Structures are given as structure tokens and as C-alpha cells.
RNA sequence: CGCGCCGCGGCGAGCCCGAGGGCCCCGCGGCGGAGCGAGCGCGAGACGCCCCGGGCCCGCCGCGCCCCUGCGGGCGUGC
């Protein structure tokens, strides 16, 4: 709304906030972000380094689906688990009935290892396991599996 | 002493007999509580805030 | 035409103004510079204390 | 609690639960804020042509000549300025302005619940302007059915005791006090009560009315409810909608209504309750303070600070 | 209360003070313009 | 004239009363701002600042960030001054008592389902308004995305990330890179 | 219209009147949720009302030692 903004506090000042030494001209810098290696240098190596140069390998065109690669840690696969029955799963840590997750059908592909699982077997089927997310989930007696 | 001799030329003083003291609190004396300057017109005020130190009446 | 080349006429009252600062109390503690010989022993001593030492 | 309901005659005929959208927190500050930014939603665009004012030839005589440098018009007419006459704006409008406002889905529904809630209060409806002082309840059920004359419309209201709040707007019908009556918004009107209805036609009997307005039940307007955002409305229910409200909320996929809160009604009684007043302890007695005045004037004020008399007086 | 009890007695004992020291300091102030002297 | 200027700094603006148009937040306040002056206790003291913040203050509590704090001291009453969320990688929760300004729905209904309890600062205010047995409790205020630019990137002593995307090597590769 | 910061509202490990279809109803992306590395790729729990610092863990660069499926795994050390 315009009838709460500052600049029609101004009225009657002759200069709108802008000075009577210096006033308000046209470009007095140039237009957009020129400058940045002359006469504002001293603002582009303060705040942002790297913006200068080249850089690494380039690709002619990226695959934005085959770099995709979702990931989950252990510590959220008993959440997908519906609640209903994860008392019961806890209840009976079964060797012979173990609940089996395949997080794929969630969306992921790659299980990686923060946090820590309950006490109970179960059976995780992924892609690719890192080397901890294996040595904590055989550590509570489950197994890793690939699947299609 | 040595402070005060750096602002000589701003300021005068010397030695007050027991009759000039007397005049200034009974007259012009008031008193600083929690920030404010309170007249001072009785001996209530200055037992309330000095007993600590055993002073209890103007005297 | 020339202009002035150079003053500090109001320099020390500029300075003043918002007190001398003073630099914080952790930076006379920074480890940044001591021997790492003298810092490595250092951590070596107290992951062996009880009292000390914070390993699960 | 349960709600009474009323023939279309006056008397008392049933009773019906209370829904449980009436529980919900009042929120001015909820229900201001999504008056403006739908009311906001309902505008037309308009703009100045965008060749106003640049369609004639004019250049600048430059110095030399005794005359300011503004663009001209052969034979030195200003032109092309905000500040000569035929002149373009400064700044002229433009119909790319954005003219409507976002709102979340959950803060629209909150804003009706919040307004439905006002209206179950006799004490917001009567402050909002409505004349209810002839009214037997002010969540006001009443069963109708089936209504085509204005004659038997009219015979309903009054069987009740609204009919004063229709005669307030048939009233004051008046032509408006600025240009607006030259933009086809000649007259004014006051505003009514409100039925809200379900299953039976009752549109055609009610509309013609002064001051009313219809809403069926399953699209509920929040610019009906709060007019001038100003929430608590007088509404006339009929029996099927007042009894669809429930089922109605239960159609709205993963909603839940929000969480009843108390009232400075209910704070101003928790601190004067033994529970609370049993903290208490009192401050220290607060310091006396007297104006200056020369104790040498007199033997007394003299006294005050020595009792002794060694001092002399004067 | 019990405020306006220790307040009248407090008063009270802060008086008889004043009239204890008075003399008693009116008494030093002559004696020193006294000793010097001797 | 009077020289006041010497040896007096300049005076201070902190936030004395809440600036939400929330109706439930002006009245809880209002409240436990006269029990402050009729009790000088400083947990209502403390209480009373907390209800004035500004939401970026007042960061949210996780269940089991509260499991964590409130153990070996079960019996006691947290207090939280923002809203309580839910955090699904704790499997299992315990038994406690919380009062917060808000509850998530999914996080109530996990409390409950323990045993615990879900108070409102006016069930506090009723029960326990001078704080006896209760904890006050509060999150990582410097944990926004937005603290952790704050600063001068590209000066050698800075540890913080520049904003947009730079794509070069000038400056970026350590010292010696400029 | 785009960028930064601050305030207030709603909901919260989630959030969301895209376009479209039947002021009401239904409605994908996306952004957030993990980072680091030029890249092959590998991938975080240990403490803490809050803030500041310390310690430790992940990636990039280096290097003892032991081993199975091996220029691959494990366990360490240092800026
Ligand atoms: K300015
Ligand atoms: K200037
Ligand atoms: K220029
Ligand atoms: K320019
Ligand atoms: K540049
Ligand atoms: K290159
Ligand atoms: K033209
Ligand atoms: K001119
Ligand atoms: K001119
Ligand atoms: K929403
Ligand atoms: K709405
Ligand atoms: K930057
Ligand atoms: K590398
Ligand atoms: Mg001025
Ligand atoms: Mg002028
Ligand atoms: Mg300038
Ligand atoms: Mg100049
Ligand atoms: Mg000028
Ligand atoms: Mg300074
Ligand atoms: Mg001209
Ligand atoms: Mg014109
Ligand atoms: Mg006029």
C-alpha cells in the first residue's frame, strides 16, 4: 500500500533522502555488474571468491536422470514401516518371519550409514549399501540384499 | 590532588569550616535513591539509607 | 586543480567515539601457532585420563 | 448443547447437536486478512492508452532562444512532459500490475470457520448492526421446506422476529455521495440476514428481499459472512443445512479444524483463584517523598532534622 | 500492621538518638578550637 | 548547559511486549506478566521474555531432543516457549510430561499413545505458575541456513560459504589462488 | 521482475489456490530432507538449556600396519 511506504514521508524536503552534495544521477557506478576486476574489486574479493576463471571438466550435455541417486539412512527405514505394525515386529524379533523393507519402491537407491537401528533382525533390498550401513544393519542380526 | 591540579583553571576550592557543611545539607542537600534526587528534609531518610554505616541523623 | 593530499585531523576522535574496543576473550587461547608436537601430546594425555576422557 | 429449531410458524419443533465448526477460535486478525486479499481478487483492470500523449511531433529548441528546453510542437507548444498541458504521464499505468493475492488453503478455511463461529454469539451478532432483540435463539434453526411466494417469505421472517432487521435495510435505500453514482453504483443498501439452505428451493420466495442473500450450504462465502470484514452475520438455517454442516467438514480430505483455545474470560478467572493468589507476596513499602523548604524559616521545620536545638534557628 | 509498629518504634529510638548526638558533637566542636589553643 | 555526555553511553531497545495480532499470545502475556510483579520470581521472569520473541528466537523442540535432556530427571515438567514437532527416527518414546505453546498433530498423538501429557501454558498457569518442579527448555537458536552466511567470504579468516553460484578459480583454490 | 535481510500468519520432516478438471471441491513437478570431490566417486553421532570454544566423525591430499572376493576390504596416523 502506498500510504505506509517512507518515501511519502518526504514530502516537503526537497531531495528525497538523496542528498544536497551528491544527489541522485543517472548511473553514477555503470549498469549491472560491471567493474568487478577495476573499480570494484575491493567488493568482489570480499564476498566473492571463485567468481573469476575456469573450473574442471565440462560435459556437452548432462543426463539429468542418469546422475540422479536418491539416498536414505538407517536411521529412517523403520519409519517406513506403517505404525500399525512396528510394535509387533519389535515384539517378536523373529529370524524366521523378519520384516523386509525394499526401499526402491519408496524411491531410493543408495543406503547409507548415520544414526543406529533398534534391536530386531530385518531385511533391507537396495542398489548399493555403503561399508558402515552394512556393518551396522549385520550387527543387529539382518542381511543386505540387491534387487532389481 | 594531582587530578584536581590538571583542572585548576576551571574550578575553585579550599577548606570549609563545620558551619559552611551545616548550611549546604540543611539547605541545599538532597539526596541520590535508586537514581533519583529526593529532598532531603528529615532524619527518616537518612537512617533508612545510611544505618549500615551507623550514620542516623543529619548530625 | 589540486585538492588536499592528506590529514588526520579528526582521526582520534572518529576512534573514540564507540570506546577501544577489545579483542575477544578466546583469542588469547586460540591454539593457531603452537608447536603441534606440544598439541599432540596434549590430546594423547587426556583421551587416557578417565576423569578426562569423552571416547563412548 | 443442542440447537432449538423452529416451524415456519413460531413455535418450538425439535432439537439438533451442535456442529463442531462453532468451537473454533475467534481470529480478527485471520479473518482481516483473508477479506483483503480475496476482496482484492474480484478487480478489473484499467490502464491509460499506452500512445496518450506521443502521437504528435516535438523536439527540443535547445538554448539560445529565451525559452526553457522542454520539446515543442512546430510553432513552440509544449509538448511531451508530464508538466505541459497534452503531455504523457510520468509514469503511466499499466495492466501488468498484479492484481490478485495468494492465500494458502488452510488459512481459507480457517477464516470461514472463524467467521461461522461469530455467528453463534447473540452478543458479536448484535455489535456487528443487527436488530435481534425479538429473536428466540441466535444460532437460529427453523424448517421452511419449500418456499416460491415472497408473501410466505415474508410471513416467516416476522413469524420469528427478523422482520425488523429487513425493514432496517428496506429503509435506507439512498443515492451514494460521490462520482461513484456515475459508475453504475447509484444506490446504497443496508445488509441483512443471511439463509443458508440445502435441499429445498427456497431462492425464488427469499431473494426479491431488501437486504438478504442466499448461500447453499456446501459452498459457504466468506465476503457473505463478514461483510465490510466485519465477522458476525445473522443467519437463517434451514433444517437441512444447519444438519449437513458436520458432514459437510467431513468432506474436506485431511483437514481437521483447529484446536479450541480460552478466553480472557477464562485468564481473568484462573488469577483470582486460590491457586494462583496463594504466591502472592507484597512489595516493600515505597519511599515518602516531600518538596525542599528551608528548615531555618521556622522552629519546626527546624526541628524535623535536629530535635535537640543546638543548631541555631536563624 | 506490624509495619506501622516497627515504624513508630524505629522513629522513636532514631530521635532520642539525635538529641544524644547532637550535644555530644556540639561538645567536640568547642573542645578542638579549645586545644589547639593550648 | 549540562555536559552529559562523558562516561554515559547510549540507551537500549529490547522487545517489552509481544508484536503477534495473535489474541492468545497477548493474554498469556498479559498473565504471566502480573504474576511476575506479585511473586518476583525470576522463572516467571524468565517465562515472561520468552513470550515476547520473534520466531526466529524461538526455534522448535524435537521429542527426542526432550528424551535426551529430560533423562534421569523423568518426573519433571519441560517447559517450551515455541512449538513441539516429532522426530520419526527415534523409534520408541518415553513417558513424560511437556507444556508447550503448540503440538504437532503427529507428535501429540505419539505423547499420548506413551503415557505422557500435553499441557498448554494455561494449564501452567493454573497448576504451577511460579515454575516448582518445572525446567525451562529451548532449541539451537543458530540453527537457520540464513546465520550460517553471515560474514566476510574470501577474507582469510572467515570459514563461511559465499551466496550464489562461482563457477571460477580466482581467490577459491586457498591462499596463493588470487 | 530478480536478489538480500527483517517482521507477522498457517502448517511442520515436511510443505505447496501449477497448468488443468468438477470466494467451494480435486490437483505433478518443485524446494527442504547430506555433504564433499575436477572427476572415477565415496558418505556423517560423542559430548552440549542457549551462545562461544574444545574434542571427535564424513569428503578431498598424503602416508604405518594386517587381510578375504584384491591398485579391492579392514584398522590407524598428519596439515
Ligand atoms: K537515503
Ligand atoms: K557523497
Ligand atoms: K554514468
Ligand atoms: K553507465
Ligand atoms: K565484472
Ligand atoms: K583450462
Ligand atoms: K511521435
Ligand atoms: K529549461
Ligand atoms: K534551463
Ligand atoms: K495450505
Ligand atoms: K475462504
Ligand atoms: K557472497
Ligand atoms: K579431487
Ligand atoms: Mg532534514
Ligand atoms: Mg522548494
Ligand atoms: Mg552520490
Ligand atoms: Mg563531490
Ligand atoms: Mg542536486
Ligand atoms: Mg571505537
Ligand atoms: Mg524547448
Ligand atoms: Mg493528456
Ligand atoms: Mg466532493
Same mark, same amino acid.
Given at each position: 500500500?502506498?500510504?505506509?511506504?517512507?518515501?511519502?514521508?518526504?514530502?516537503?524536503?526537497?531531495?528525497?533522502?538523496?542528498?544536497?552534495?551528491?544527489?541522485?544521477?543517472?548511473?553514477?557506478?555503470?549498469?549491472?555488474?560491471?567493474?568487478?576486476?577495476?573499480?570494484?574489486?575491493?567488493?568482489?574479493?570480499?564476498?566473492?571468491?571463485?567468481?573469476?576463471?575456469?573450473?574442471?571438466?565440462?560435459?556437452?550435455?548432462?543426463?539429468?536422470?542418469?546422475?540422479?541417486?536418491?539416498?536414505?539412512?538407517?536411521?529412517?527405514?523403520?519409519?517406513?514401516?506403517?505404525?500399525?505394525?512396528?510394535?509387533?515386529?519389535?515384539?517378536?524379533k523373529?529370524?524366521?518371519?523378519?520384516?523386509?523393507?525394499?526401499?526402491?519402491?519408496?524411491?531410493?537407491?543408495?543406503?547409507?550409514?548415520?544414526?543406529?537401528?533398534?534391536?530386531?533382525?530385518?531385511?533391507?533390498?537396495?542398489?548399493?549399501?555403503?561399508?558402515?550401513?552394512?556393518?551396522?544393519?549385520?550387527?543387529?542380526?539382518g542381511?543386505?540384499?540387491?534387487?532389481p | 590532588?594531582?587530578?584536581?591540579?590538571?583542572?585548576?583553571?576551571?574550578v575553585?576550592?579550599?577548606?570549609?569550616?563545620?558551619?559552611?557543611?551545616?548550611?549546604?545539607?540543611?539547605?541545599?542537600?538532597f539526596?541520590?535513591?535508586?537514581?533519583?534526587?529526593?529532598?532531603?528534609?528529615?532524619?527518616?531518610?537518612?537512617?533508612?539509607?545510611?544505618?549500615?554505616?551507623?550514620?542516623?541523623?543529619?548530625? | 586543480?589540486?585538492?588536499?593530499?592528506?590529514?588526520?585531523?579528526?582521526?582520534?576522535?572518529?576512534?573514540?567515539?564507540?570506546?577501544?574496543?577489545?579483542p575477544?576473550?578466546?583469542?588469547?587461547?586460540?591454539?593457531?601457532?603452537?608447536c603441534?608436537?606440544?598439541?599432540?601430546?596434549?590430546?594423547?594425555?587426556?583421551?587416557?585420563?578417565?576423569?578426562?576422557?569423552?571416547?563412548? | 448443547?443442542?440447537?432449538?429449531?423452529?416451524?415456519?410458524?413460531?413455535?418450538?419443533?425439535?432439537?439438533?447437536?451442535?456442529?463442531?465448526?462453532?468451537?473454533?477460535?475467534?481470529?480478527?486478525?485471520?479473518?482481516?486478512?483473508?477479506?483483503?486479499?480475496?476482496?482484492?481478487?474480484?478487480?478489473?483492470?484499467?490502464?491509460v492508452?499506452?500512445?496518450?500523449?506521443?502521437?504528435?511531433?516535438?523536439?527540443?529548441?535547445?538554448?539560445?532562444?529565451?525559452?526553457?528546453?522542454?520539446?515543442?510542437?512546430?510553432?513552440?507548444?509544449?509538448?511531451?512532459?508530464?508538466?505541459?498541458?497534452?503531455?504523457?504521464?510520468?509514469?503511466?499505468?499499466?495492466?501488468?500490475?498484479?492484481?490478485?493475492?495468494?492465500?494458502?488453503?488452510?488459512?481459507?478455511?480457517?477464516?470461514?470457520?472463524?467467521?461461522?463461529?461469530?455467528?453463534?454469539?447473540?452478543?458479536?451478532?448484535?455489535?456487528?448492526?443487527?436488530?435481534?432483540?425479538?429473536?428466540?435463539?441466535?444460532?437460529?434453526?427453523?424448517?421452511?421446506?419449500?418456499?416460491?411466494?415472497?408473501?410466505?417469505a415474508?410471513?416467516?421472517?416476522?413469524?420469528?422476529?427478523?422482520?425488523?432487521?429487513?425493514?432496517?435495510?428496506?429503509?435506507?435505500?439512498?443515492?451514494?455521495?460521490?462520482?461513484?453514482?456515475?459508475?453504475?453504483?447509484?444506490?446504497?443498501?443496508?445488509?441483512?440476514?443471511?439463509?443458508?439452505?440445502?435441499?429445498?428451493?427456497?431462492?425464488?420466495?427469499?431473494?426479491?428481499?431488501?437486504?438478504?442473500?442466499?448461500?447453499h450450504?456446501?459452498?459457504?462465502?466468506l465476503?457473505?459472512?463478514?461483510?465490510?470484514?466485519?465477522?458476525?452475520?445473522?443467519?437463517?438455517?434451514?433444517?437441512?443445512?444447519?444438519?449437513?454442516?458436520?458432514?459437510?467438514y467431513?468432506?474436506?480430505?485431511?483437514?481437521?479444524?483447529?484446536?479450541?483455545?480460552?478466553?480472557?474470560?477464562?485468564?481473568?478467572?484462573?488469577?483470582?483463584?486460590?491457586?494462583?493468589?496463594?504466591?502472592?507476596?507484597?512489595?516493600?513499602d515505597?519511599?515518602?517523598?516531600?518538596?525542599?523548604?528551608?528548615?531555618?524559616?521556622?522552629?519546626?521545620?527546624?526541628?524535623?532534622?535536629?530535635?535537640?536545638?543546638?543548631?541555631?534557628?536563624? | 500492621?506490624?509495619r506501622?509498629?516497627?515504624?513508630?518504634?524505629?522513629?522513636?529510638?532514631?530521635?532520642?538518638?539525635?538529641?544524644?548526638?547532637?550535644?555530644?558533637?556540639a561538645?567536640?566542636?568547642?573542645?578542638?578550637?579549645?586545644?589547639?589553643?593550648? | 548547559?549540562?555536559?552529559?555526555?562523558?562516561?554515559?553511553?547510549?540507551?537500549?531497545?529490547?522487545?517489552?511486549?509481544?508484536?503477534?495480532?495473535?489474541?492468545?499470545?497477548?493474554?498469556?502475556?498479559?498473565?504471566?506478566?502480573?504474576?511476575? /510483579?506479585?511473586?518476583? !520470581?525470576?522463572? =516467571?521472569?524468565?517465562?515472561?521474555?520468552? $513470550?515476547?520473541?520473534?520466531?526466529?528466537? #524461538?526455534? %522448535?523442540?524435537?521429542?527426542?531432543?526432550?528424551?535426551?535432556?529430560?533423562?534421569?530427571?523423568?518426573?519433571?515438567?519441560?517447559?517450551?516457549?515455541?512449538?513441539?514437532?516429532?522426530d520419526?527416527?527415534?523409534?520408541?518414546?518415553?513417558?513424560?510430561?511437556?507444556?508447550?505453546?503448540?503440538?504437532?498433530?503427529?507428535?501429540?498423538?505419539?505423547?499420548?499413545?506413551?503415557?505422557?501429557?500435553?499441557?498448554?501454558?494455561? /494449564?501452567?498457569?493454573? !497448576?504451577?505458575? =511460579?515454575?516448582?518442579?518445572?525446567?525451562? $527448555?529451548?532449541?539451537?537458536?543458530?540453527? #537457520?541456513? %540464513?546465520?550460517?552466511?553471515?560474514?566476510?567470504?574470501?577474507?582469510?579468516?572467515?570459514h563461511?560459504?559465499?551466496?550464489?553460484?562461482?563457477?571460477?578459480?580466482?581467490?577459491?583454490?586457498?591462499?596463493?589462488?588470487?
Amino acid at each position: 500500500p502506498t500510504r505506509i511506504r517512507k518515501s511519502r514521508k518526504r514530502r516537503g524536503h526537497r531531495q528525497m533522502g538523496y542528498g544536497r552534495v551528491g544527489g541522485h544521477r543517472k548511473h553514477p557506478s555503470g549498469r549491472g555488474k560491471a567493474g568487478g576486476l577495476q573499480h570494484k574489486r575491493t567488493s568482489f574479493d570480499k564476498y566473492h571468491p571463485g567468481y573469476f576463471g575456469k573450473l574442471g571438466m565440462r560435459n556437452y550435455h548432462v543426463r539429468r536422470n542418469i546422475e540422479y541417486n536418491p539416498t536414505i539412512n538407517i536411521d529412517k527405514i523403520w519409519s517406513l514401516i506403517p505404525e500399525e505394525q512396528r510394535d509387533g515386529f519389535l515384539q517378536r524379533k523373529s529370524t524366521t518371519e523378519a520384516p523386509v523393507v525394499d526401499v526402491t519402491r519408496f524411491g531410493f537407491f543408495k543406503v547409507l550409514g548415520r544414526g543406529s537401528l533398534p534391536q530386531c533382525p530385518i531385511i533391507i533390498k537396495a542398489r548399493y549399501f555403503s561399508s558402515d550401513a552394512e556393518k551396522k544393519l549385520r550387527e543387529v542380526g539382518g542381511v543386505p540384499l540387491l534387487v532389481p | 590532588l594531582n587530578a584536581l591540579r590538571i583542572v585548576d583553571h576551571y574550578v575553585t576550592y579550599g577548606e570549609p569550616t563545620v558551619e559552611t557543611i551545616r548550611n549546604l545539607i540543611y539547605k541545599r542537600g538532597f539526596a541520590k535513591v535508586n537514581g533519583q534526587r529526593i529532598p532531603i528534609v528529615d532524619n527518616n531518610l537518612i537512617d533508612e539509607q545510611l544505618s549500615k554505616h551507623n550514620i542516623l541523623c543529619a548530625e | 586543480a589540486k585538492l588536499k593530499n592528506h590529514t588526520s585531523k579528526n582521526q582520534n576522535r572518529k576512534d573514540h567515539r564507540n570506546g577501544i574496543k577489545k579483542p575477544k576473550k578466546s583469542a588469547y587461547t586460540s591454539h593457531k601457532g603452537m608447536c603441534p608436537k606440544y598439541l599432540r601430546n596434549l590430546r594423547r594425555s587426556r583421551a587416557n585420563d578417565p576423569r578426562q576422557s569423552l571416547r563412548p | 448443547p443442542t440447537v432449538k429449531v423452529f416451524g415456519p410458524t413460531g413455535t418450538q419443533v425439535a432439537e439438533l447437536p451442535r456442529p463442531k465448526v462453532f468451537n473454533v477460535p475467534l481470529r480478527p486478525d485471520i479473518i482481516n486478512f483473508v477479506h483483503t486479499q480475496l476482496r482484492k481478487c474480484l478487480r478489473t483492470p484499467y490502464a491509460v492508452s499506452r500512445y496518450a500523449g506521443v502521437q504528435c511531433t516535438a523536439h527540443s529548441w535547445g538554448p539560445g532562444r529565451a525559452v526553457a528546453r522542454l520539446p515543442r510542437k512546430h510553432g513552440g507548444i509544449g509538448a511531451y512532459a508530464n508538466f505541459a498541458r497534452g503531455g504523457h504521464m510520468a509514469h503511466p499505468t499499466t495492466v501488468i500490475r498484479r492484481w490478485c493475492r495468494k492465500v494458502n488453503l488452510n488459512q481459507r478455511r480457517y477464516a470461514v470457520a472463524s467467521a461461522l463461529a461469530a455467528s453463534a454469539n447473540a452478543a458479536l451478532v448484535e455489535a456487528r448492526g443487527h436488530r435481534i432483540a425479538d429473536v428466540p435463539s441466535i444460532p437460529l434453526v427453523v424448517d421452511t421446506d419449500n418456499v416460491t411466494k415472497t408473501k410466505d417469505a415474508l410471513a416467516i421472517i416476522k413469524a420469528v422476529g427478523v422482520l425488523r432487521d429487513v425493514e432496517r435495510c428496506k429503509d435506507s435505500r439512498h443515492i451514494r455521495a460521490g462520482r461513484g453514482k456515475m459508475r453504475n453504483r447509484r444506490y446504497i443498501t443496508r445488509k441483512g440476514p443471511l439463509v443458508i439452505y440445502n435441499t429445498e428451493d427456497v431462492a425464488r420466495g427469499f431473494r426479491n428481499l431488501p437486504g438478504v442473500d442466499l448461500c447453499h450450504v456446501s459452498s459457504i462465502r466468506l465476503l457473505e459472512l463478514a461483510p465490510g470484514s466485519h465477522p458476525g452475520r445473522l443467519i437463517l438455517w434451514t433444517k437441512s443445512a444447519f444438519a449437513s454442516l458436520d458432514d459437510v467438514y467431513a468432506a474436506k480430505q485431511n483437514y481437521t479444524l483447529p484446536r479450541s483455545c480460552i478466553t480472557q474470560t477464562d485468564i481473568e478467572r484462573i488469577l483470582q483463584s486460590d491457586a494462583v493468589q496463594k504466591t502472592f507476596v507484597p512489595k516493600r513499602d515505597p519511599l515518602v517523598i516531600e518538596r525542599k523548604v528551608d528548615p531555618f524559616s521556622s522552629k519546626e521545620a527546624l526541628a524535623r532534622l535536629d530535635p535537640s536545638g543546638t543548631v541555631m534557628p536563624k | 500492621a506490624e509495619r506501622a509498629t516497627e515504624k513508630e518504634k524505629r522513629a522513636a529510638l532514631v530521635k532520642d538518638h539525635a538529641v544524644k548526638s547532637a550535644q555530644v558533637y556540639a561538645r567536640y566542636y568547642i573542645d578542638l578550637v579549645e586545644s589547639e589553643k593550648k | 548547559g549540562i555536559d552529559l555526555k562523558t562516561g554515559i553511553k547510549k540507551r537500549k531497545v529490547e522487545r517489552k511486549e509481544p508484536k503477534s495480532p495473535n489474541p492468545y499470545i497477548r493474554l498469556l502475556h498479559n498473565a504471566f506478566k502480573v504474576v511476575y /510483579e506479585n511473586t518476583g !520470581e525470576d522463572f =516467571t521472569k524468565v517465562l515472561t521474555k520468552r $513470550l515476547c520473541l520473534s520466531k526466529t528466537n #524461538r526455534p %522448535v523442540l524435537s521429542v527426542s531432543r526432550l528424551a535426551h535432556l529430560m533423562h534421569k530427571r523423568e518426573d519433571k515438567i519441560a517447559v517450551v516457549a515455541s512449538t513441539v514437532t516429532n522426530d520419526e527416527r527415534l523409534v520408541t518414546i518415553p513417558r513424560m510430561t511437556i507444556c508447550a505453546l503448540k503440538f504437532s498433530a503427529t507428535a501429540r498423538s505419539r505423547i499420548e499413545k506413551a503415557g505422557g501429557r500435553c499441557m498448554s501454558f494455561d /494449564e501452567l498457569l493454573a !497448576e504451577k505458575p =511460579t515454575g516448582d518442579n518445572c525446567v525451562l $527448555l529451548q532449541g539451537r537458536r543458530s540453527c #537457520r541456513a %540464513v546465520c550460517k552466511k553471515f560474514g566476510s567470504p574470501g577474507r582469510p579468516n572467515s570459514h563461511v560459504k559465499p551466496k550464489g553460484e562461482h563457477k571460477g578459480r580466482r581467490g577459491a583454490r586457498g591462499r596463493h589462488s588470487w
